């Protein structure tokens, strides 16, 4: 006919769960991505040099990245 009435299983629950899931994964996704971006930008990653003479290096900072 003009327009038949289609029969679909349902639209509400699938689309709903997806909307929710995306909402949360993004909800703490965005602050973290922004963070990695910032500390990637304003704060520098790091640079090497070498162990100074008669100097005690601390526990951390044996490692390049600042979040490390």
């Amino acid at each position: 006919g003009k327009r038949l009435f289609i029969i679909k299983p349902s639209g509400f629950y699938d689309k709903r769960f997806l909307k929710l899931l995306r909402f949360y994964i993004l909800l703490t996704g965005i602050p973290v991505v922004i963070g990695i971006t910032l500390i990637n930008v304003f704060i520098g990653e790091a640079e090497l040099a070498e162990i100074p003479e008669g100097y005690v290096p601390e526990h951390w900072e044996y490692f390049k990245h600042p979040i490390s």
Binding site: G1, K2, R3, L4, F5
Partner: protein, 39 residues
């Protein structure tokens, strides 16, 4: 070997049901979809 007349009536009014059900089944009153409320 024609039929059973009973089956003639049964088949016939079953056709009636298909008639009405499919009349229903075609839907375009009021465009029922109404979702809200160069270079």
């Amino acid at each position: 070997s024609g039929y059973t007349p009973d089956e003639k009536l049964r088949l016939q009014q079953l056709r009636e049901l298909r008639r009405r059900w499919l009349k229903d089944q075609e839907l375009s009153p009021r465009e029922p979809v109404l979702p809200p409320r160069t270079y």
